[PDB]
Design a protein around this ligand. Structure first.
Ligand SMILES: Cc1cc2nc3c(=O)[nH]c(=O)nc-3n(C[C@H](O)[C@H](O)[C@H](O)COP(=O)(O)O)c2cc1C
Ligand SMILES: Cc1cc([C@@H](C)NC(=O)c2[nH]cc(-c3c[nH]c4cc(C(F)(F)F)ccc34)c2C)no1
Ligand SMILES: O=C(O)c1cc(=O)[nH]c(=O)[nH]1
Length: 376
C-alpha cells in the first residue's frame, strides 16, 4: 500500500519523480537521489527475498537476482541506502586512479516516452583513494548491520582521460581498493572515452585480463579480504554492444582462455539514432531501446563461450518479464539503471515480485532452472 506507510512504494516518491522527469535536469535529479541516500532518508525493503530466486556466480551468493549497475553510485557515497531499497548488489564506479570532472555539463538527457537515456559523462569520479575510503566505511557499517550482511559490492575500474596504457591505471586501482571488493569489473566498453573500446581487441583484452588477475593474485603476497565473500575478488569484463560477429567470437575465445569469472553484457550503445529528442546529442544510449540489442548479445556470447562464462545482464530491464528474458537467454543475474530512473524507489520491490510471479506462472522450481533455457 503506497499511502498508509513509508516504504519503497510510498506514493509521494512517485509524485515527486513524475515532477522531476518533466521539469528537472537529469543530473540534478540524480544528485537529489544521492543526497537522500547519503542521509539514509530513503525507505527500506525489510522483506525476506524468496529463496527460489537466489542465484550465484562461483562463490558469490546473491540473495536475489537484481543489482544496480555501474555509473549510478560512481563514488560509493550511498551504497547502504541503494542496497536497502531491495537490491542484492551494487557495482560502484567506474573509478579511475585520480579524480576527474568528466565532460562539461549538461551531459545526461532522458526521453521518458521511450524510457531512454543518453550520456557523455566521461568517467567523472572522486578518484580511487577517496572512493576506497568510502567503501571502507561501508564495510565497517556492514559488519554490524542485520540488513547488509550478505549484500555484494563490486568495483568497476577504468583509466584517467590522460592515461596512455590502461593497465597502469587498472593496477593502481586494484592495489588500492581490491581487498574491499567482492568483484572487479574491467570497463573496456564506455563509448565516452575515445579509444577505450579498442581494448576489446583480442590481443589487448587478453593482456588486460591477465594483468588484472595477476595484480589481484599478488595482493595476498604483499584479515586480508574485507569484503562480503572473504575471498579475493572475482574478475568480470564489461562489454560494448557495438561489435560485429567476428569481434564477438574472438572476445569469447579470450574469455575462455583467460578463465575470466564473468561477463557483464552490456554497456550503452552508439547505434540508436531514432530518438528525436536525442538527435544532436553525444554519448551512449541506455534504457528500453537497448533491451533487444543486449539480449541478443547475451544469447550470442552464451553460445560462443559454450555456456562456461556466467553472464551479468545489463540493458533495458524494467519488468519481471524483461528479467526473465535475460535469464533464459543466459544471464545468471541482472543489473538495473534506467529502471531506477523511470520507476524510482519501488523499482526493486516491484521487479522482484513480478519475477517471482513469472517463475510460478512458467512452472520453474527456482530461478537457476531458468538460466539459459531459451537454448535448451
Ligand atoms: C549516466 C550513466 C552513467 C553510466 N556510467 C557507467 C560507468 O561509469 N561504468 C559502466 O560500466 N557503465 C556505466 N553506465 C552504463 C550502465 O551501467 C548500464 O550498463 C547501461 O545504462 C544499460 O543499462 P540500462 O538500460 O538498464 O540503463 C552508465 C549509464 C548511464 C545512463
Ligand atoms: C549519473 C547520473 C544519472 C543521471 C540521470 C539519468 N538520473 C536520473 O534522472 C535519476 N536518478 C535517480 C532518479 C530518481 C528516482 N526516483 C527519484 C525520486 C526523487 C525525489 F524527488 F523523490 F526525491 C528524486 C530523484 C529520483 C532520477 C530521476 N544523471 O546523472
Ligand atoms: O562515464 C561515462 O561516460 C560512461 C561510462 C560507461 O561505462 N558507460 C557509459 O555509458 N558512460
Amino acid at each position: 500500500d503506497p499511502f498508509e506507510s513509508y516504504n519503497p512504494e510510498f506514493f509521494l516518491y512517485d509524485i515527486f519523480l513524475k515532477f522531476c522527469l518533466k521539469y528537472i535536469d537529469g543530473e540534478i535529479c540524480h544528485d537529489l537521489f544521492l543526497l537522500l541516500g547519503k542521509y539514509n532518508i530513503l525507505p527500506y525493503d525489510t522483506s525476506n527475498d524468496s529463496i527460489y530466486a537466489c542465484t550465484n556466480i562461483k562463490h558469490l551468493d546473491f540473495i536475489n537476482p537484481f543489482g544496480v549497475a555501474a555509473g549510478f553510485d560512481k563514488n560509493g557515497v550511498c551504497i547502504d541506502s541503494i542496497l536497502k531499497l531491495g537490491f542484492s548488489f551494487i557495482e560502484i564506479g567506474t573509478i579511475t586512479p585520480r579524480g576527474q570532472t568528466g565532460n562539461a555539463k549538461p551531459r545526461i538527457f532522458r526521453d521518458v516516452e521511450s524510457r531512454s537515456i543518453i550520456n557523455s559523462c566521461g568517467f567523472n569520479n572522486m578518484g580511487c583513494d577517496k572512493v576506497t575510503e568510502n567503501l571502507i566505511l561501508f564495510r565497517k557499517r556492514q559488519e554490524e548491520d542485520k540488513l547488509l550482511s550478505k549484500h555484494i559490492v563490486g568495483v568497476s575500474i577504468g583509466k584517467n582521460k590522460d592515461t596512455v596504457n590502461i593497465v597502469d591505471d587498472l593496477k593502481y586501482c586494484i592495489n588500492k581498493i581490491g581487498r574491499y571488493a567482492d568483484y572487479i569489473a574491467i570497463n573496456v566498453s564506455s563509448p565516452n572515452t575515445p579509444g577505450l573500446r579498442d581494448n576489446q581487441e583480442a590481443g589487448k583484452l587478453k593482456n588486460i585480463i591477465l594483468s588484472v588477475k595477476e595484480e589481484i593474485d599478488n595482493l595476498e603476497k604483499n584479515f586480508l579480504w574485507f569484503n562480503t565473500t572473504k575471498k579475493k575478488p572475482l574478475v568480470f569484463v564489461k562489454l560494448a554492444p557495438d561489435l560485429n560477429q567476428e569481434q564477438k567470437k574472438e572476445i569469447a575465445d579470450v574469455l575462455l582462455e583467460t578463465n575470466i569469472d564473468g561477463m557483464i553484457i552490456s554497456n550503452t550503445t552508439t547505434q540508436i539514432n531514432d530518438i528525436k529528442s536525442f538527435e544532436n546529442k553525444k554519448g551512449g544510449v541506455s534504457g528500453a531501446k537497448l533491451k533487444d540489442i543486449s539480449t541478443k548479445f547475451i544469447c550470442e556470447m552464451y553460445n560462443y563461450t559454450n555456456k562456461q562464462i556466467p553472464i551479468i545482464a545489463s540493458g533495458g530491464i524494467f519488468s519481471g518479464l524483461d528479467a526473465l528474458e535475460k535469464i533464459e537467454a543466459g544471464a545468471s543475474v541482472c543489473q538495473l539503471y534506467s529502471c531506477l530512473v523511470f520507476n524510482g524507489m519501488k523499482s526493486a520491490v516491484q521487479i522482484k515480485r513480478e519475477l517471482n510471479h513469472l517463475l510460478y506462472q512458467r512452472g520453474y522450481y527456482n530461478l537457476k532452472e531458468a538460466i539459459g533455457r531459451k537454448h535448451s
